[PDB]
Design a protein around this ligand. Structure first.
Ligand SMILES: Cc1cc2nc3c(=O)[nH]c(=O)nc-3n(C[C@@H](O)[C@@H](O)[C@@H](O)COP(=O)(O)O)c2cc1C
Length: 146
């Protein structure tokens, strides 16, 4: 399983660390990478992929995931021939573009034909219970979808 973290400050990364550990706890071969250090040209090669992404100024994706989101949004983006996914997003209702990055990644993947393992989870500023409830569900799902 490949867990991708896209954080401007470092919160998605922390959740990803908790999540990867739950999967190390439930399975074992888990790879945790930051969007800035993932050779995303092989994202296709993933059987089970998780993305954790925050939403930034003007609803823009996290910096480390810009090339990735742009790539995933490019005419050169590959079809998720055999890739399934789940997205967790950190956002704030006070902003207009609440959780837009999650909406973007969730959409484009599905548009490309990726299989959604779990409905996208949008998280507000309190964030910490969503990551946990979401964490508990991907574990249950992945145990049931591998
Ligand atoms: C400059 C800035 C702008 C942001 N803009 C938005 C926004 O438009 N919508 C949103 O849902 N979240 C926005 N966030 C994200 C925050 O709501 C919050 O989820 C943050 O803690 C995410 O941290 P992470 O990047 O470490 O995951 C913004 C954060 C920063 C620093």
């Amino acid at each position: 399983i490949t867990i991708i973290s896209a954080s401007q400050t470092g919160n998605a990364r922390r959740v990803a660390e908790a999540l990867r550990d739950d999967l190390l706890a439930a399975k074992l071969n888990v790879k945790l990478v930051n969007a800035g250090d993932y050779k995303f040209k092989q994202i296709a090669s993933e059987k089970l992929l998780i993305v954790v992404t925050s939403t930034q100024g003007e609803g823009e994706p996290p910096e480390e995931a810009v090339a990735l989101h742009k790539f995933l949004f490019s005419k050169k983006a590959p079809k998720l021939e055999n890739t399934a996914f789940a997205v967790f997003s950190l956002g704030d209702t006070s902003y207009e573009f609440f959780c837009q990055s999650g909406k973007d990644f969730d959409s484009k993947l599905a548009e490309l034909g990726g299989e959604r393992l779990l409905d996208r989870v949008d998280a507000d500023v309190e964030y910490q219970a969503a990551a946990s409830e979401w964490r508990a569900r991907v574990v249950d799902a992945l145990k049931s979808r591998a």
